[PDB]
Design a protein around this nucleic acid. Structure first.
Length: 577
DNA sequence: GCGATCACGT
DNA sequence: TACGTGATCGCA
């Protein structure tokens, strides 16, 4: 039983409570709060949001840091409250983040899934209450109130077993001193948003739309007919049946038309390069021009991404609506999209700082490979140095292609692709790709020892850990299916690297946020993109940020090799180059 | 709505 | 044959 409360009472304002501030819209920015549940020592309460959020006592309680609250996904509630001008403070336990740390593979995305991990089932899955997709809807107050109170009661009951297991895992500080403080920082970043120059995007979209119209009609003349170029099935009929082009790779449905195969088909027919060009432009047009414009808020002309802090199995952040971690950078045609991301105030600039090879540096530290550590202590170009060692040549004799291949090997450790994926990366036979790995391991015997030892440790312990004690369980490491086992082995290798790099960037973000307030700067964190932090700040703060930001990021952790940070500022994201 | 394909980032 | 998000198409 619970109290369907008409008025906020003092007993609802205890200094420890499980709190539910329910935002049902997936995108919680400027989104309705549909109800509020409080469970504490005095009872279980349901409050109507129009009532509670108009009560000065309740609002003050929400903002009192000394009034401790346990929640699930507090960032959703905090951001939704920010859009109403209300601060949420004192969240001392976030069940979503706790469950994520305990086992990222469970996919915990509602209270019921977290509660199941502790054999607590007195709460329904959110999707059973709200429905899915089209039929999604807020239910009537009795149904809604019961659900919110049950979620709050679950959070109340589950704090102690989650904290206990975190303590046993040595993840208590990881939760309380890293992920939870980071959650508040992400909330501010999402709420601030990034200003977009929508007229420049529209101008880009106009230039693409005319270039698409031209490549499109060229393709139809080359195909002798019109067809849906965006339809991989139809393009497959044109290329492989009508034009008799050789089939170099298959997919489950039919023949591949990936940029992979197309480049190898270009010498056979004029249409292929035009198809490729059409795919480039259409990717920019559909995903990046039209995609961004769809999610710019016309009130603020900002995009307000949502960082998902409890999703990746490595501890990396992901971001959605829009995903700003895949804005093109590699090709100039697509890099120019970043010119659309501008400072949100006049006479401010974008400041971007990025770790140089943090993943390989983490590997050098974790593997204690003398050669790799020395390379970073010498601040060498790691790809050039790797080519020198693999091919047994001096720096003067590294060709561009030798560096490209060494870079692909290093790439294949940072991500832990298969030797098959290396072979395919370098368009080289699987066997020659294998003697590349072997030459690498004789030049870097500490990395080899690390790969072997971490695989054994994953098998023996059942999981691998990162520098800050994030863990990833790898049950497939004992599998008899070769492909399933190999992937688990690669994850055993890659996760302490990628996850430790993620850990360092998170600590840097926390340290930078504290330092920015210490220094009384107006600079504000806007975006993290895996290895980069992007800020905006008055132009009068650039010079201080050039010293402060790299210092904070480089001192976030002490490794056996230096951390190196490159930084740039400019009038747009593009120009912060 | 779902699976399959493709492609973008780190 | 890292970690993802998202657009499109084709099918029921």
């Amino acid at each position: 039983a619970f109290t369907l409360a008409d008025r906020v009472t003092e007993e609802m304002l205890a200094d420890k409570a499980a709190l539910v501030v329910e935002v049902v819209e997936e995108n919680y920015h400027d989104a309705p709060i549909v109800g509020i549940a409080v469970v504490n020592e005095h009872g279980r309460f349901f409050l109507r949001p129009e009532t509670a959020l108009a009560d000065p006592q309740f609002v003050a309680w929400l903002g009192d840091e000394t009034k401790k609250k346990s929640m699930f996904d507090s960032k959703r509630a905090a951001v939704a409250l920010k859009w109403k001008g209300i601060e949420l403070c004192g969240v001392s336990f976030d069940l979503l983040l706790a469950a994520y740390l305990l086992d990222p593979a469970q996919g915990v995305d509602d209270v019921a899934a977290a509660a199941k991990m502790k054999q607590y089932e007195a709460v329904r899955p959110d999707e059973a209450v709200y429905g899915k997709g089209a039929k999604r809807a807020v239910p009537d107050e009795p149904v809604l109130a019961e659900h919110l109170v049950r979620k709050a009661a679950a959070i109340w009951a589950l704090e102690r077993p989650f904290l206990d297991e975190l303590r046993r895992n040595e993840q208590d500080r990881l939760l309380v001193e890293l992920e939870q403080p980071l959650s508040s920082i992400l909330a501010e970043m999402e709420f601030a948003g990034v200003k977009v120059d929508t007229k420049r995007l529209e101008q880009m979209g106009e230039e693409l739309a005319e270039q698409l119209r031209t490549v499109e009609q060229r393709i139809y003349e080359l195909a002798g007919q019109e067809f849906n170029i965006n339809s991989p099935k139809q393009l497959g009929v044109i290329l492989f049946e009508k034009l008799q082009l050789p089939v170099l790779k298959k997919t489950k449905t039919g023949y591949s038309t990936s940029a992979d195969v197309l480049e190898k088909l270009a010498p056979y027919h004029e249409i292929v390069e035009n198809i490729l060009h059409y795919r480039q432009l259409g990717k920019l047009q559909s995903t990046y021009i039209e995609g961004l414009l769809k999610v710019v808020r016309p009130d603020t002309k900002k995009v307000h991404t949502i960082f998902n802090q409890a999703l990746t199995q490595t501890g990396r952040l992901s971001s959605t609506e829009p995903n700003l971690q895949n804005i093109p950078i590699r090709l100039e045609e697509g890099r120019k999209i970043r010119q659309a991301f501008v400072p949100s105030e006049s006479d401010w600039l974008i400041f971007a700082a990025d770790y140089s090879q943090i993943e390989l540096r983490v590997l050098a530290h974790i593997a204690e490979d003398d050669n790799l550590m020395e390379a970073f202590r010498r601040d060498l170009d790691i790809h050039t140095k790797t080519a020198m060692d693999i091919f047994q040549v001096s720096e003067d004799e590294v060709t561009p292609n030798m560096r490209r291949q060494a870079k692909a090997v290093n790439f294949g450790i940072v991500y832990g692709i298969s030797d098959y994926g290396l072979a395919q990366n370098l368009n080289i036979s699987r066997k020659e790709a294998a003697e590349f790995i072997e030459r690498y391991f004789e030049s870097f015997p500490g990395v080899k020892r690390y790969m072997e030892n971490i695989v054994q440790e994953a098998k023996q312990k059942g999981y691998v850990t990162t520098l800050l004690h994030r863990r990833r369980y790898l049950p497939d490491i004992t599998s008899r299916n070769f492909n399933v086992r190999s992937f688990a082995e690669r994850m055993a290798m890659n996760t302490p690297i990628q996850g430790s790099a993620a850990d360092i960037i998170k600590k840097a973000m926390i340290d930078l946020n504290a330092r920015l307030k210490e220094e009384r700067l107006q600079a504000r964190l806007l975006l993290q993109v895996h290895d980069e932090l992007i800020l905006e700040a008055p132009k009068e703060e650039m010079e201080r940020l050039c010293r402060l930001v790299p210092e904070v990021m480089e001192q976030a952790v002490t490794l056996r090799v230096p951390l190196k940070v490159d930084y740039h500022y400019g009038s747009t994201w593009y120009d912060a180059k």
